[model samples]
Target: DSKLKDFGKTVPVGIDEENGMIKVSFMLTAQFYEIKPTKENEQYIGMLRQAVKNESPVHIFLKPNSNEIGKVESASPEDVRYFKTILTKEVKGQTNKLASVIPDVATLNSLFNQIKNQSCGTSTASSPCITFRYPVDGCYARAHKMRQILMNNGYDCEKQFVYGNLKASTGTCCVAWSYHVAILVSYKNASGVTEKRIIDPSLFSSGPVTDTAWRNACVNTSCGSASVSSYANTAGNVYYRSPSNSYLYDNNLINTNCVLTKFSLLSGCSPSPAPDVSSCGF
Candidate 1:
């Protein structure tokens, strides 16, 4: 891998100079916030300004795209701003709604009492807690449901896990079907940073399993039970899960659990060079 020797310098990978215009792109990994622009995006833009002001040796052109021309241009900025505002408002509103639904301290106390009375166990002074497991088939099914929910919520997602028969390399009579569940969430951050969040319910959470054990289980198990364990461990760290499957425990997979598998950026295409007007004249 080539390390950027001059991080401070603007390296132009593509350029078009003939039309009194130049197009340039930068490579950077940034976070995208669902609500609004992040501080990192703001910082990168600041860096761009600094690069242009100091290190960039050539003049750069900034032209509004086709969307900025004609009558359409008049209201585009307002439209964009209004849309962003609405989106932020909706996200905040949803967040508030979720917060409200979350059990309060008093409600939790009462619920704990009910559960204890129902013989579901109770907390002790040191470590009183109940253990729960996501059913094997139910785990995969719920994972599938989560994939759909995320997609419906505007996240680009794909169904990944399917069980199929496979032959063992050892040439034994152990031919069996292996189960797998993987879902990929692809999205663009506010600053155009493309990212993919992969959820392999089998690989992300193995509830009540440690990371090392979960890893080993996934590697050694022929039925991909280890993958399921890992997913459970991963998701258990994150409280989000399917609504109907409330019985399923939340793994609470944070950034530490969900790994960054891929990333990219969206940049305007390079402008074509202007034709030679003098050579075209007869």
Candidate 2:
């Protein structure tokens, strides 16, 4: 006789409602091969069974089409029972509130300025350094802000462009825009040698630093005011486009990991404390 295939094997699991305990057992015939379960597999199976058993039922009531205004038609007895069963099993839980924290704009600007200054060696040597790349979204606004901050702080900063190859899913494009926003910092020991640092927006702490917002505030606003060719032509060369793509230059050059560490130190925002699973109201 041929051996049976392991096609429709059913596992029986038991759950303890109070302690959330689960036990699983597999049922198989002699013709089919049996493998002993590992500790990890047992743990996973227990968790899966616990999750299923703890799920709450939802009640959905369907009404027949009745011409009467705002009234449901009579439901069949079986349908009503089914609806009741669903309602009885539905579970209710609260959503995680920690995920809802929004970043403030002022905080974001401060972070950006701080990161830019740190990169330029204006602040303490322990400060975080960042670098950005060109044509990157959201960098324009950040770069603009950085320039303003540096200028206000008595530092000479300029935005420059570098032409580079651009690759995309669509096709090859010519004259790819690569801009750099650099802050000219004078070293105390080496006064003649000038140091340039890239500004990174990701180092800032305003709610969700998105590329779209940065680009819109920096590049698109300039391009929209002028023609596309005019903006692209004047981007990094003769005339630096106001709110230029210069901001995109800092994207990759800056050390994001350093920025993150420095941010926590300067801002005094510590990592959120882990939650106690016992109090989760499971």
Candidate 3:
């Protein structure tokens, strides 16, 4: 009870040198934990970096009341296999829940544009304050906010998640994420047929896009797979069965972190006025 412990396979995400922190994906919690690196913990940090490099899991203990790394070690082969089995099973198990159908493309188009218009500014006052202008982080929060808005407007929506080694170039900069989530809804097209679409302002400011287009926009085909689940699943979940099976919902953490990270790039988030796109593809 004196310490919090976690174990999970690592993301290809990098070290946070600016913040003096390292992030680890948690298995039981299905969320990221910030661990402070220190001089005395060099040995553990060495092991942790290797674990991250190999995309392997490590067992860790945190100092009480803080993110300070206390004790850390690599996972056994048996434990590794067990996690792989469960993760694969969970991904295979996910399927899209039925979506509330919007009558026509016109209505759907309007709704999509409205949501995108709510993207957070340098100082925003909009409810659900979607941070679309800032694509560097807080994607789960943005998706959650958009889902809330859609549901409040009397449209039923679900969430779509893409998981695996993921990297996307935003034109302005290249970002990496282990997973990403966005709102999913259905709408009748000009052909009078219903089609599932994704409303994620972070990746697309224009309007809603088809599921395949959304997935393709987020990650290279060699990277990951996508799935859909009902809105009952919390936006804070980093994986399937998270917050439900684990019974741990870090809503406060998500909201607080989102507030800080979901600001426009012009708001001192980057060293330059805007993220330099010159070296992005290079």
Q: Which candidate is the best by TM-score?
A: 3
Worst 10 residues of 3 by lDDT: 273-282
Model 3 earns a TM-score of 0.54
User: lDDT by residue for model 2 over 111-190, one digit each (tens)?
Assistant: 34454444422354232333221122222333444443444443433443222111111112111122322222222223
lDDT of 3: 0.53
Runs off by more than 4 Å, candidate 1:
1-132, 162-177, 189-191, 200-202, 205-217, 221-282
Candidate 3 clash pair list:
none
Q: What is model 2's C-alpha RMSD?
A: 24.5
Flag the better candidate by TM-score, 2 or 3.
3
Q: What's the C-alpha lDDT at position 101 in model 3?
A: 79
The residue-by-residue lDDT of candidate 1 on 21-137, one tens digit each, is: 222332110100011134533443443435333322221222223111011001244543542332221211111112112123333233223322221122331111111121121
Give the Cα lDDT of each candidate.
Answer: 0.25, 0.27, 0.53
Error of 3 at 159 (Å): 0.6
Best by lDDT: 3
The local lDDT score (0 to 100) that residue 63 gets in candidate 3 is 63
Cα lDDT of candidate 2 equals 0.27
